[PDB]
Amino acid sequence: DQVRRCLRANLLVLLTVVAVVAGVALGLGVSGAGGALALGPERLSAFVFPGELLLRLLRMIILPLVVCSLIGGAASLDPGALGRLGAWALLFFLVTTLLASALGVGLALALQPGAASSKEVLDSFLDLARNIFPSNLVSAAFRSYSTTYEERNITGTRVKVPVGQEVEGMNILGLVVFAIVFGVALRKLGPEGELLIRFFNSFNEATMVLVSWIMWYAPVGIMFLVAGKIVEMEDVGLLFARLGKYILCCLLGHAIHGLLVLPLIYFLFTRKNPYRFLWGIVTPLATAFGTSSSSATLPLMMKCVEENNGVAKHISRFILPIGATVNMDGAALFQCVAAVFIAQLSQQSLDFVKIITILVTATASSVGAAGIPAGGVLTLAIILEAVNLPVDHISLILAVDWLVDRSRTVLNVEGDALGAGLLQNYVDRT
Amino acid sequence: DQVRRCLRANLLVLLTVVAVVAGVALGLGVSGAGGALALGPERLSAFVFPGELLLRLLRMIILPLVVCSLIGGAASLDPGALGRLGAWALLFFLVTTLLASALGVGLALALQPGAASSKEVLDSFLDLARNIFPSNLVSAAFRSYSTTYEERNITGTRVKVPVGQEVEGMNILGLVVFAIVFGVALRKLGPEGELLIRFFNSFNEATMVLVSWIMWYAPVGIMFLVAGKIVEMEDVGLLFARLGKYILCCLLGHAIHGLLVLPLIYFLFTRKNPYRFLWGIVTPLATAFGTSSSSATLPLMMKCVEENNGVAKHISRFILPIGATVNMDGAALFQCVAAVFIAQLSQQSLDFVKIITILVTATASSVGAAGIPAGGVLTLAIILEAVNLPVDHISLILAVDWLVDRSRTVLNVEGDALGAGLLQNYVDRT
Amino acid sequence: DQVRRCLRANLLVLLTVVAVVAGVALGLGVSGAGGALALGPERLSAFVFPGELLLRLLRMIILPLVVCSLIGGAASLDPGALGRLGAWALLFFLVTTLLASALGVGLALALQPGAASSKEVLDSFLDLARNIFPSNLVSAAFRSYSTTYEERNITGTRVKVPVGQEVEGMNILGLVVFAIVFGVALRKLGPEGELLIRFFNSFNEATMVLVSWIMWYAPVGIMFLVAGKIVEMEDVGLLFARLGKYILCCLLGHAIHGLLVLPLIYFLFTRKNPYRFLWGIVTPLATAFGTSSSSATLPLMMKCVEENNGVAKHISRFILPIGATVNMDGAALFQCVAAVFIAQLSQQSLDFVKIITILVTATASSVGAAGIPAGGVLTLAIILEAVNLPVDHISLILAVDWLVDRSRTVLNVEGDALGAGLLQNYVDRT
DSSP states (O other), rough: OEEEEEETHHHHHHHHHHHHHHHHHHHHHHHTTTTTTTTOHHHHHHHHSSHHHHHHHHHHHHHHHHHHHHHHHSOOOOOOSSOOGGGHHHHHHHHHHHHHHHHHHHHHSSTTTOOOOOOOOSTTHHHHHHHSSSOSSTTTTTEEEEEEEEEOOOSSSOEEEEEEEEESSSSTTTHHHHHHHHHHHHHHHHHHHHHHHHHHHTTTTTHHHHHHHHHHHHHHHHHHHHHHHHHHHHSSSSSHHHHHHHHHHHHHHHHIIIIIIIHHHHHTTSSOOOHHHHSSHHHHHHHHHHHHOOOOOOOOHHHHHHHOOOOOOOOOOOEEEESSSSSOHHHHHHHTTTSSSTTTTOOOOHHHHHHHHHHHHHTSSSSSOSTTTTTHHHHHHHHHTTTTTGGGGGTSSSHHHHHHHHHHHHHHHHHHHHHHHHHHHTTSSO | OTTTTTTTTHHHHHHHHHHHHHHHHHHHHHHTTTTTSSOOOOHHHHSHHHHHHHHHHHHHHHHHEEEEEEHHHSSOOOTTSGGGGGGGHHHHHHHHHHHHHHHHHHHHHHSSOOOOOOOOSSTTTTTHHHSSSSSSTTTTEEEEEEEEEOOOOOOSSSOOEEEEEEEEEEOOOOTTHHHHHHHHHHTEEEEGGHHHHHHHTTTTTHHHHHHHHHHHHHHHHHHHHHHHHOOOOOOOTTTHHHHHHHHHHHHHHHHHHIIHHHHHHHHHHHHHHHHHHHHHHHHHHHHHHHOOOOOHHHHHHHHHHHHHOOOSSSSSTTSSSSSSOOOOHHHHHHHHHHHTTTTTTTOOOOOOOHHHHHHHHHTTTSOTTTTTTHHHHHHHHHHHTTTTOOOOGGGSTTTTTTHHHHHHHHHHHHHHHHHHHHTTTTSSSO | OOTTTTTTSSSHHHHHHHHHHHHHHHHHHHHTTOTSSSHHHHHHOOOOOHHHHHHHHHHHHHHHHHHHHHHHHHHHHOTSSOOOGGOOOOOOOOHHHHHHHHHHHHHHSSSSSSSSOOOOOOOTHHHHHHSSSSSSSSSSSSEEEEEEEEOOOOOSSOEEEEEEEEEOOOOSSSTTTHHHHHHHHHHHTGGGGGGHHHHHHHHHHHHHHHHHHHHHHHHHHHHHHHHHHHHTTSSSSTHHHHHHHHHHHHHHHHHHHHIIIHHHHHHHTTTOOOOHHHHSSSHHHHHHHEEEEEESHHOOOOOOHHTOOOOOOSSHHHHHHSSSOOOHHHHHHHHHHHHTTTTTTTOOOHHHHHHHHHHHHTTSSSSSTTSSSSHHHHHHHHHTTTTTOOGGGTTSSSSSSSHHHHHHHHHHHHHHHHHHHHTTTTTTTT
């Protein structure tokens, strides 16, 4: 009786969990021989080919997406005409998202999950500040700046001077900055520039449907990508231990954040115990753990914040609906652990500017992730292509995304709940 | 009395036939010395320079044209709300255009006209399936994917593994696929995405006027291109024999198609003799041979299909006006013989995926060719740039385009006439 | 009392003159040691880095600016429906701007200011005519055509044949030509193509505000650019002599033009003495020298042309407001002396086609310069990037721009004043 009411509703989720559980089985059926006994390199990158085609489609789409959604979502970003009473709420959201992402990078650099087994001088801050502001906007859709060294035989015979050249791989770091600045420009332009907001916001909605079609293709690509990814490692008992250490490190980041950082930020200004606040708001967190979505939590959260932890009733309907779309600390933890776990699963050595352009671009991507159908994974592929990491390891993270999701939902509501607790103590004392 | 009523009406056609007949004369006046006695290579590519400038202008225009006309013509492509009663007519049009193009490629590979006188493994189907879906959309306006080989000294000392890189020459194969998918996306988006259809369909009409100006320049370019093309061959009696074999092979393809393939497709389902149908519709084919245009045939064809070969009168006003713009089998023959005659006039060896991306891109270009002023030749330059063939041989084909046109018009009306004969036998039996 | 009425009004001009006068002081404070005693090349291009960031931002903006302002300003270019009675005025404006620019190039090639201290054959007119009409429009936003030579061992063993390749650096020469032709196309398209004029003219006004923000950043960049530019020369008493010879040559070009060329053009057709005309129009030129702006001159100029040098009263309100925005001979002198002074300040040897694409692109940029905030300097950076000159010397020209501006304003009003004197003698004789 439930063959056309349950399976038809979430057919894509059943299809991708069948494709993952038959992707590990196909990879084990190839690894029973191995990566070189069935067929060698002449057909190794022809068995894994739909798992390359999915990445071709995703890299095709993240060029219109991050430059047409940021223009339409920074031209519709209101200044303090929206209210300076909730601008401290936006500052709190940005600061706690940056602290969440920095805690994720720090914890998955300290615990080091996945690492079980060119020389560039420290002035590559210049190689990032030349990359924020690109030289032109058509040669910043496929290639970025990079400084290489040489010898000129001056002052003796050997000295290392840097020379600059634009090498391949697009810069999403310098194409979200132009998109943000152009969105602020179209907001400042007023009613003369509404045609551009309508054009760039009908172009973003004409790309989300392409994401819908690509995610409908994505079971086949994720099956062959998992199959090609657990064969190339030539080890199955080690990769599941690396995934277990990844889940342990990300759950530890969620627990450490939501039990010691946001309580400390609440205690530093309110100077009342935040655990009484959390004991008031158990049941919205208990249903956010339940349904694993921050949309069905918001009415019950906006209700239950009133009776126990009494607020002024005009900020809890103002910062809470913009606290479940803008403030997402759990997605910041997931992007900043699941993109320094891939950097220790392929040994890319994680230069000190890759930390900055994995931290600020996952702060600037947890505020607009939950509009995309597969939001948290395509917005991880964006920050993987922004630091030139291998995107092919996205399927070992999409395989264990449910264990992380069921405790990732609660941080996104805990953040703006403690923001509602914090912002009421800047108006009860003036 | 007819100096301002006849010459002013078709001045471009008189100008281009004067420029062709003075292009062969100028090429013969240079070949009286030859390609190296007047001036050598220091001024050989300075005498043929306007015939290079015309190709620069055409390659400039086929980037906005095939990506802004396909979006506007696939967003205005109606689904079966247009009618499933004539969706078998569209399937018939696509199948007979593919069969016409395959017959053209097969016949001009078998008879081999024009051939009178890098190693890549058979897995370059991967090099086309990586090219359908490009990696990004700004680096697919000038460069396409291509797999090259090397040696890695593994398993012995010598093995041939493929490595990938994006080499120059744009991919029109993977820029019509994104345009088609984006047009279907803008159709699905409904009334929120009408601004993009108006933008991309005012951008296509603001490029057709550039085609009008370039075709007004085109006499000078075609004169110097013919002059440079019959000098470089260093032979005049052989090139006219190759053009004669080209005209013979394309006329043989038209005759074989319109007398043995579409009759066979009609006989396989209706099982009545199609030559009685053609004996009913002699005179619309006889005036389509006359005026050499499928626009002045359509009222007389839509009339004469009724009285003799009686139809249900609601499909002959429905599939016939969409059978003279969409179904063009003669243009498919002309594109798929005149682009494997250039591949045997310059020895490009015609790899087995170039047959596929000369067959499906001339099936997908005979449905939108007759809106451009010089439609059948610019849409041949498109499929020449899609397979990296030399576009410079377009002027030996535009020189003999009248002998092919006067029997190319009749296939485009014979196709939908037999489609009207076929579709009436899927409703008289239900 | 004047701390919030004078300093708040022109804060950017005070900030940039403080940044220039503290840019020469910082450069002298580094040159007290020199370019290699404080820190060598490992930190020489890290002290001059904001003066590189300003050039990165300017090269980012001149790609949307010159292709979105020319479309919107050539689609709003009226044909002779504006009037053939003032089309000779537009021809006069174009001819005197070309003569002004040619006099500037000739005078700063003859006097040779700043010159105190690859082989390509003369057929690089082909390398410019292949660059006017680019091969495609996405690979003409960052790279242009360039012919290099080789040897093929034919006809002996050594001969020099040219081969072509697209090398880096965008072609603004071939991206204003497509923009002009597209603007004429959108004008011809009529009311079907008003959406594109509104899109490309709301995109140009959404880039002028980015020029406003970049010019607000520009004090820091111009301070560090002046500081890095007077250190690298390793000479301070010579660079100020080169700037003095630059000011002398440009003032000599202004004086020679406005006292011997436009008087000669007036005398060649009217055959009356133009110095009586100038003695009538002393005081509009005397206030144009005063306020240094051609906007506050136009009412007094349009008044004072009537009473003394009597005109037909319908051309002095028609060609004078389009003579203070379109005709700017002083800006043509400044662009065509200040871009062959940089070519003699860095020894780029000034090939005979760089004269043509520094002359016609500064004729085609003095007609739309006075809409940009820093118009005369960004429109100099455009023509410096169009000929691949070093843009880094823009700050030695922006430092002495006031001495040139106060006598550059008077040529832009003298031009259309003598045009009003000229055009009245093609209607008083018919």
